[PDB]
Structure 1
Amino acid sequence: IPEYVDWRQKGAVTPVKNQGSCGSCWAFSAVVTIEGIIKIRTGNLNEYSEQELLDCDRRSYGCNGGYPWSALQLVAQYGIHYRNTYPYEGVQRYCRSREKGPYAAKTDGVRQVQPYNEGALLYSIANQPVSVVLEAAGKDFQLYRGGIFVGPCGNKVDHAVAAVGYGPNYILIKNSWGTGWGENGYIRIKRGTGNSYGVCGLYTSSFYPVKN
């Protein structure tokens, strides 16, 4: 795998979103990986519905948090609508998949990256955008304005984001806190510290969709 990966450079990343006060990060994280793999497989970049996952993933707890892997399982088992047809409201409502016609995209499964393994995550990122979790509760992460982020932070993961690239010293992350946060909505998180958790627990729980 190469020294630099940036899926934005290959037109596989849609504009930065803002999840608002709703604990829907898990749905935003999942959708970034779907938008990525559909572009890589079909050559078309589309936006897909975070709201649909928020409403329809019965394993997750709507705006009270959820599971990127369960969201990705749902897209593999059923599918997902375009964001345009099922737009984001920042509140959990009834699952309205049936009322919005046939699904726009479908995947063939979900895979976990070997956890607590930097090389395993970089290998997956080289192939496609990956759903990752980290500790975002800390003020340092909340007030991040740019540069390579080293913390401070603990490993108490509480927030799902998407790894869309890496460099020699960092992993490139798409956050769902709008374009005003960090580097136009992105964070470069320090890698290669030798801490198996990753910086802010970045290696705790990572999933990517499978599509043939």
Structure 2
Amino acid sequence: IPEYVDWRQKGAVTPVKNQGSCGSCWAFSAVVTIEGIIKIRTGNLNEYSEQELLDCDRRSYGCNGGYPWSALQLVAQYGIHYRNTYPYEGVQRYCRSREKGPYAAKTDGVRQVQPYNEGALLYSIANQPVSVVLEAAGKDFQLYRGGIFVGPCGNKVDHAVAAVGYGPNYILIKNSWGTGWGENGYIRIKRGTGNSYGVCGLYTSSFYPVKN
């Protein structure tokens, strides 16, 4: 795999979003990976619906948190609408998929990256954007405004984001806290520290969609 990957340069990443106060990070993370894999497979970059996952995933807890895995499983079982068709409201409502016409995209499955393994995560990122989790509760992560981040942070993961690239000493992460946080909404988290958890627990739980 190469030294640098950046799916933004391949036109596979949509603009940075703001989840607001709702604990919907799991849905934002899943949607980044869907937008990526649909571009890779079909050539078209579209925005897909975080709100639909928020409303419709009965394995997750709405604005009180959820699971990237079950969000990706839902898209593989049913499909997902365009963001425009089912836009983000920041509050859980009833599932409105059937009112809003046919789904716009569908995937075929979900796979996990081997956990606690930096090289396995880089390998998956070289193929597509990957849903990853990290510990975001610490003030250092909250206040991050640029540079290669090394913490302080622990491994008490609590926040789902999306890995859309990497370089020699970092992994490139799209966050859902608006463009005013980090590097235009992104963070470069240091890699290669020898900590099997990853910096801020970044290697704990990583998933990506499968689309034949």
Offset of residue 17 of structure 1? 0.2
Q: After superposition, give the CA deviation of every residue in 1:149-187 in whole Å (9 maximum; x if it has no partner).
A: 000000000000000000000000000000000000000
How far did 1:198 drift? 0.1
What are the superposed Cα offsets for residues 104-145 of structure 1, whole Å, 9 maximum, x if unpaired? 000000000000000000000000000000000000000000
- SS of 1:99's equivalent in the other structure is coil
- After superposition, what is the alpha-carbon deviation per residue over 1:183-211, rounded to whole angstroms, capped at 9, x for unaligned? 00000000000000000000000000000
TM-score normalised by L of structure 2: 1.00
SS at match of 1:38: helix
Q: Find the aligned partners of 1:203 and 1:90 in 2 and give their Cα distance.
A: 28
Find the residue that maps to 1:27 and give its secondary structure: helix
Q: Write the distance in 2 (CA, Å) between the matches of 1:78 and 1:57.
A: 11
Question: Residues of 1 paired with 2:195 and 2:6: CA distance?
Answer: 24
- Match of 1:167? 167
Describe the SS at the equivalent of 1:124: helix
Structure 1, unaligned runs of 5 or more: none
How do residues 27-176 of structure 1 correspond to structure 2 at under 5 angstroms?
27-176=27-176
Structure 1: distance between partners of 2:82 and 2:167: 31
By how many angstroms is 1:29 displaced? 0.1
- How far is the alpha carbon of 1:31 from its aligned partner? 0.1
Distance 2:62 2:22 in 1: 8
TM-superposed CA distance for 1:2, in Å, is 0.2
1:103 CA drift (Å): 0.3
Give how far 1:40 is off.
Answer: 0.2
Q: Deviations over 1:32-77 (max 9, x none)?
A: 0000000000000000000000000000000000000000000000
User: Match of 1:98, SS?
Assistant: coil
Ranges of 4+ aligned residues in structure 1 off by more than 2 Å: none
Secondary structure class of the residue paired with 1:85: coil
Distance 1:102 1:28 in 2: 21
Q: Percent identity of the aligned residues? A: 100
Count of residues in correspondence between the two structures: 212
Cα RMSD after superposing both structures: 0.2
Structure 2: distance between partners of 1:91 and 1:205? 26
Counterparts of 1:133 and 1:173, CA distance in 2? 10
Q: Once the 2 structures are TM-superposed, how far is the Cα of residue 89 of structure 1 from its aligned partner? A: 0.2
Whole-angstrom distance in 2 between the partners of 1:117 and 1:145: 27
Q: Taking structure 1 as the reference length, what is the TM-score of the superposition? A: 1.00
